[PDB]
Each structure stands twice: as C-alpha cells, then as structure tokens.
C-alpha cells in the first residue's frame, strides 16, 4: 500500500502545482485586462472559474481511477495470500501427528489474511461513506456481500479445527486471542 500512498501524495502535489499556475495566470489575466470593459472583466472571472472547475474534476477523476486500480491489485494479491495460507493450514491439520504450534501459526497467517481483506474492504467503503454518502449507498450491497463471504469462509475454515479436537483444545485460548 506504499505504492498507493506514494501515488496518492504525488497526485496531490501535481494538482496543487496545476492549481497554482491557474491562480497566477488569473492574476495576470486580471491585470492584463484592467484596461477593459465590465462585461469583458466578468468574462475573465467566469473563464478562470471554469478553468478551476475542470481542474478539480480531472483531479477527482485521477483519484478515483487510482483507488480503482489499487482495489483490483490488492484483491488479487490478498486472494493469493489467502489461498496459500489456507493450504498450509489445511496441510498442518492433516499432519501425522498434528503439531499444535505449527497448526496455530498457519491458522494465524490465514486468519490475518482474511482480517486484512475485511479491513481493507471496510476501510475503503467507510472512506466513501464519509466523503460521499450517496455514492456509498450505491456500492453498499456489493461491499456487504463481499464482507459476508469473507466471514463465512473464515468461520468454515476455523470450524475445521474441530476435526482434530486434541489440537483444538491445546490452542483454543490463543486462537481466541486472535479473534478477540
């Protein structure tokens, strides 16, 4: 996500630099227009106001596209991190004999992968809800659906632990720390 915060910061510096050039050009336009009629003086104001307006719109566009790519990329990576962890956890469960600490460390990596996915998803949805509530209402369903899926999957994965009760009893408390 460093990739993202860096892009984010640069997007801002770009927009802020562009916003500065406009405010200058405006100043000069104002001056190089003093020797002008009212209607022509009001045209300059309108003109730079519309210039600022389009600049803000394109920055909004860049920001949106940036998060969109970010979400896509992070989802593919999180999915893979989850798949590998789940495999290592299931494989630990079937070891003969099963080793409690090894099962726990693999389970922890898997739970953390799922928690990461849930957290990232929720944080991005909440960001939208805070800045643009009406827009959040539009993706609400898709988001909650993805969250429920993560919840069901993690719980089903955790339930596998009860197929090896001896192991479950030995790591139950630490597993609780994990979910608490």
Curated annotation (Swiss-Prot):
Q: Extract the ranges annotated as region (Collagen-binding).
A: 136-153
Q: In which tissues is it expressed?
A: Expressed in the brain and in cerebrospinal fluid (at protein level). Expressed in all fetal tissues examined with highest levels in brain, kidney, heart and spleen. Weak expression in liver. In adult brain, highest expression found in the frontal lobe of the cortex and in the anterior perisylvian cortex-opercular gyri. Moderate expression in the cerebellar cortex, the posterior perisylvian cortex-opercular gyri and the temporal associated cortex. Weak expression found in the striate, extra-striate and motor cortices. Expressed in cerebrospinal fluid, and plasma.
Sorted alphabetically, the keyword list is:
Alzheimer disease, Amyloid, Amyloidosis, Apoptosis, Cell adhesion, Cell membrane, Cell projection, Coated pit, Copper, Cytoplasm, Cytoplasmic vesicle, Disease variant, Disulfide bond, Endocytosis, Endoplasmic reticulum, Endosome, Glycoprotein, Golgi apparatus, Heparin-binding, Iron, Isopeptide bond, Membrane, Metal-binding, Neurodegeneration, Notch signaling pathway, Nucleus, Oxidation, Phosphoprotein, Protease inhibitor, Proteoglycan, Secreted, Serine protease inhibitor, Signal, Sulfation, Transmembrane, Transmembrane helix, Ubl conjugation, Zinc
One Gene Ontology term, aspect cellular component: early endosome membrane
Keyword Coiled coil carried by entry: no
Q: How is it modified after translation?
A: Proteolytically processed under normal cellular conditions. Cleavage either by alpha-secretase, beta-secretase or theta-secretase leads to generation and extracellular release of soluble APP peptides, S-APP-alpha and S-APP-beta, and the retention of corresponding membrane-anchored C-terminal fragments, C80, C83 and C99. Subsequent processing of C80 and C83 by gamma-secretase yields P3 peptides. This is the major secretory pathway and is non-amyloidogenic.
Region (Heparin-binding) location: 4-36, 104-135
Any one GO MF term held by the record is:
enzyme binding
> Which residues are recorded with the post-translational modification Phosphotyrosine?
110
Q: Does the keyword Secreted apply?
A: yes
Q: What is the effect of changing residue 116 to A?
A: Reduced affinity for heparin
**Residues annotated with Phosphoserine modification:** 54
- Glycosylation site residues: 155
Q: Which disease is it linked to?
A: Alzheimer disease 1: A form of Alzheimer disease, a neurodegenerative disorder characterized by progressive dementia, loss of cognitive abilities, and deposition of fibrillar amyloid proteins as intraneuronal neurofibrillary tangles, extracellular amyloid plaques and vascular amyloid deposits. The major constituents of these plaques are neurotoxic amyloid-beta protein 40 and amyloid-beta protein 42, that are produced by the proteolysis of the transmembrane APP protein.
So what family is this one in?
A: Belongs to the APP family.
Q: In UniProt terms, what function does this protein have? A: Functions as a cell surface receptor and performs physiological functions on the surface of neurons relevant to neurite growth, neuronal adhesion and axonogenesis. Interaction between APP molecules on neighboring cells promotes synaptogenesis. Involved in cell mobility and transcription regulation through protein-protein interactions. Can promote transcription activation through binding to APBB1-KAT5 and inhibits Notch signaling through interaction with Numb. Couples to apoptosis-inducing pathways such as those mediated by G(o) and JIP. Inhibits G(o) alpha ATPase activity.
Q: What is known of its domains?
A: The transmembrane helix undergoes a conformation change and unravels partially when bound to PSEN1, facilitating cleavage by PSEN1. The basolateral sorting signal (BaSS) is required for sorting of membrane proteins to the basolateral surface of epithelial cells.
- Could you share any additional remarks the record makes about this protein? Chelation of metal ions, notably copper, iron and zinc, can induce histidine-bridging between amyloid-beta molecules resulting in amyloid-beta-metal aggregates. The affinity for copper is much higher than for other transient metals and is increased under acidic conditions. Extracellular zinc-binding increases binding of heparin to APP and inhibits collagen-binding.
What is this protein identified as? Amyloid-beta precursor protein
First and last residue shown, out of the full length, are 388 to 567 of 770
